Amino acid sequence: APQQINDIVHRTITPLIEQQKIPGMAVAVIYQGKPYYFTWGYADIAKKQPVTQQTLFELGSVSKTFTGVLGGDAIARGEIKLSDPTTKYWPELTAKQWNGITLLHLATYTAGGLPLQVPDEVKSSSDLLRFYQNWQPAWAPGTQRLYANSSIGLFGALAVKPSGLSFEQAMQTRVFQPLKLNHTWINVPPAEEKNYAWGYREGKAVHVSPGALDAEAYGVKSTIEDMARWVQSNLKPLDINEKTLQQGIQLAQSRYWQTGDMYQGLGWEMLDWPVNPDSIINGSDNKIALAARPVKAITPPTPAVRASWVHKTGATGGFGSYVAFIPEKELGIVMLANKNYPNPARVDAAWQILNALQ
Ligand SMILES: O=C(O)Cc1cccc(NS(=O)(=O)c2cccc(Cl)c2O)c1
């Protein structure tokens, strides 16, 4: 890699790993289109396995960017419309609060206060039906944003219903395979378990627990190489040969809602470039990111703006991830760690690296 990339990456990540006590970390920088990879530390402390470019990390909420693109692809295929009522795809959702809640509201956390977590008590799809039937919105649709796995998770499950495919099968055949994400998984196969890092929470090795809508909201595991390819695919969608996937990527980067200086896409979140770092750094703290905020509708949504900082943070119990890119500069970064450390430390590190390279 160009020494300037090496210099900025090492000077930024080495102190981060020390301050945050991160067992293992992988970073990719995309710079003038090409990827540069960096790895530190341990995927498995007990078995002394190092992090490599083939290590699988839990992406957590970065999985929502795949869900948003997969939904976008279903729109481009004509299988669904974001303007469709939720009840078009789940007719048993007869409770009156669902009148007026569309797939767009589900995809963008604006249905009216669907909760962050699906309750652990919910297992079967009849448990899920009961949960959504009994849920009482705090707000009218399209008035406030509350980040929610129960919101975008339901969007992902419903968006693939016309295809007849399971969510995992739609994701594999329509997103992973066309993009050659051949080491990206919803369920890690036995053959790849040797590469699956452990997460670390309070010093204990942990993996993500099963839960309802987990595949749709936080289910993806991936390598730093596949994630750099994911970023390149989102940086330059028009290089993608499959036409509905190309349009689906663009739909996921459209600006549907505004709160503060942040715009909500499908999975992705965006700010105007150039950004105020304090705005994305403080804004990524869960005290802001997970809070209830009024939104202004973008009527009609703005198509993907090249002069944007596009990003997503992600966590599981044992992992912390971050992806960001600037299409106008052909610049991007992926940070994958097997410890869940504070979001503002992630964004600060990413800002320092990308600002130095732009
Ligand atoms: O480890 C597990 O068993 C479950 C688990 C724990 C913690 C986070 C997640 N991922 S989440 O629900 O999607 C999410 C929620 C809020 C913020 C972020 Cl950044 C995020 O990723 C999943």
In contact, 336 and 85? CB cutoff 8 Å: no
To the query of whether residue 61 is one of the catalytic residues in this protein, the response is: yes
**Residue with token string 């976008």:** 72
Residue 338 assigned as binding residue: no
Å from CA of 208 to ligand 1 middle: 9
Q: Which of 133, 132, 149, 312 is nearest to 216 (CA)?
A: 149
Q: What is the Cα–Cα distance from 71 to 160, expressed in whole angstroms?
A: 7
Centre of ligand 1 to C-alpha 315, Å, is: 5
Experimental method used, please? X-ray
- Residue whose entry in the numeric block shows the structure tokens 């339901």: 154
Q: What is the DSSP letter of 198?
A: P
Provide the residue type at 338 as one letter. N
Atom of ligand 1 nearest to the CA of 206: 1
Residue position matching structure tokens 């949504």: 301
Contact yes or no for 54/188 (Cβ under 8 A): no
Separation of alpha carbons 136 and 96, rounded Å: 10
Residues with CB under 6 A from ligand 1: 60-61, 149, 208-209, 217-218, 286, 313-317
338: Cβ–Cβ under 8 A, 6 or more apart, which residues?
22, 23, 24, 25, 43, 51, 57, 58, 197, 198, 199, 200, 318, 319
61, 213, 311, best to mutate for ligand 1 pocket (most atoms within 8 Å of CB): 61
What are the beta bridge partners of residue 184? 222
Cross-strand bridge partners of residue 199: 206
Q: Are 293 and 144 in contact (CB under 8 A)?
A: yes
Rounded CA-CA distance 347/311 in Å is: 9
Bridge partners (DSSP) listed for residue 313: 322
The alpha carbon of 248 and the centre of ligand 1 are apart by a number of angstroms equal to: 25
Residues 6+ apart with CB under 8 A from 170: 70, 74, 160, 163
Substitution candidate for ligand 1 out of 66, 208, 286 with most atoms within 8 A of CB: 208
Q: Is 6 annotated as a binding residue?
A: no
| Domains of the chain, earliest start first | 1-358 (3.40.710.10)
Q: Is 315 annotated as a binding residue?
A: yes
Helix-strand-coil percent breakdown of the chain, rounded to 5? 40, 25, 35
Which stretches within 77-187 are classed as H helix? 103-107, 125-134, 149-159, 167-171
Q: How many angstroms does the Cα of residue 334 sit away from the middle of ligand 1? A: 18
* Pairwise CA distance, residues 178 & 207, whole Å: 28
Q: Which helix (H) or strand (E) holds 227?
A: helix 224-235
Cα distances (angstroms) measured from residue 104 to each of 24, 37, 127, 202, 264: 37, 36, 23, 38, 11
Distance between first and last Cα of the chain: 16
Q: How far is the CA of 112 from the centre of ligand 1 (A)?
A: 21
Per residue in 92-130, is it b (16+ CB within 10 Å) or e — as a string?
A: ebeeebbeebbbbbbbbbbbbbbeeebeeebeeeeebbe
61 is in an annotated binding site: yes
| HSE-up of residue 220 (Cα within 13 Å, Cβ side) | 33
Which residue owns the Cα nearest ligand 1 atom 22?
316
Q: Is 222 annotated as a binding residue?
A: no
Q: How far apart are CA 227 and CA 57, in angstroms?
A: 10
Ligand 1 closest atom vs CA 286: 17
* Displacement of CA 157 from its chain's centroid (Å): 16
